Design a protein around this ligand. Structure first.
Ligand code: CL
Ligand code: CL
Length: 250
């Protein structure tokens, strides 16, 4: 699988955004290849323009592209499902009820698809009502983490995208998600409010739980607003943290 070479020592792959193809190349070099680089569907008016762009970013970085919704924006879920017919990338961000469509649309090309599920205020339970119609309903479907993992697997997904975390604001809920993932042999992608000061703790929680594959997403906290570029020195600093941390689980 293409994404497997993106995990440092098989444990942690960074997910950060690229502003342009030069930024993607510089990020990929700074992360020593242990990264998938987000290109957002929202940034393009059509599926065709998105596909063209993503292939052009991919050409340079061994197709280590993460196909984005745009901060988990559920209106982009149908657009991402459609992009999947024409470009698999290495990694695809998707909302829970569109995972199945996206896997089918890949038409057998290898890729890794996450499933957006959200905190609920209830330790042990995730909100799977993350598509456009489901997110707009009066009640949400709030279910035990492991039942959500089982359903994601039935839809052809590889991981839980846990969002929005607001950093460590929901630490106890995140701890239980990490535990459930580890026990089910399933991958986890913490997202939302991750910065250079809470990055190590968030990843460590997952590793300590014994989650095998973790993909932390680090977005605007490492983006230089002057250029819109993800900062290369920040990506270097994050990889150094990843190595120091993972080298302890031998
Ligand atoms: Cl996304
Ligand atoms: Cl957040």
């Amino acid at each position: 699988t293409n994404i497997q070479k993106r995990f440092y020592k098989g444990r942690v792959a960074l997910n950060v955004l690229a502003n342009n193809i030069e930024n993607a190349k510089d990020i990929f070099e700074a992360a020593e290849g242990y990264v998938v680089v987000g290109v957002l569907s929202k940034d393009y008016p059509t599926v065709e323009e998105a596909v063209t762009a993503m292939k052009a970013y991919g050409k340079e970085i061994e197709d280590a592209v993460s196909i984005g919704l745009g901060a988990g924006d559920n209106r982009q879920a149908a657009v991402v499902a459609e992009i999947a017919k024409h470009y698999p990338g290495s990694h695809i961000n998707q909302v829970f009820p569109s995972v199945g469509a996206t896997r089918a649309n890949l038409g057998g090309k290898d890729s890794w698809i996450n499933s957006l599920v959200s905190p609920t205020g209830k330790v042990g339970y995730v909100n799977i009502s993350t598509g456009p119609i489901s997110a707009a309903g009066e009640e949400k479907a709030i279910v035990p983490i492991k039942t959500a993992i089982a359903l994601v697997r039935d839809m052809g997904g590889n991981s839980l995208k846990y969002f929005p975390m607001k950093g460590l604001a929901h630490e106890e809920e995140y701890r239980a998600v990490a535990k459930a993932c580890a026990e089910e042999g399933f991958a986890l992608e913490p997202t939302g409010g991750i910065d250079k000061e809470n990055f190590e703790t968030i990843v460590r929680i997952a590793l300590e739980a014994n989650v095998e594959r973790v993909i932390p997403h680090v977005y605007s906290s490492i983006i230089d607003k002057e250029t819109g570029n993800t900062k290369v020195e920040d990506v270097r600093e994050l990889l150094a943290v990843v190595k120091k941390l993972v080298d302890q689980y031998a």
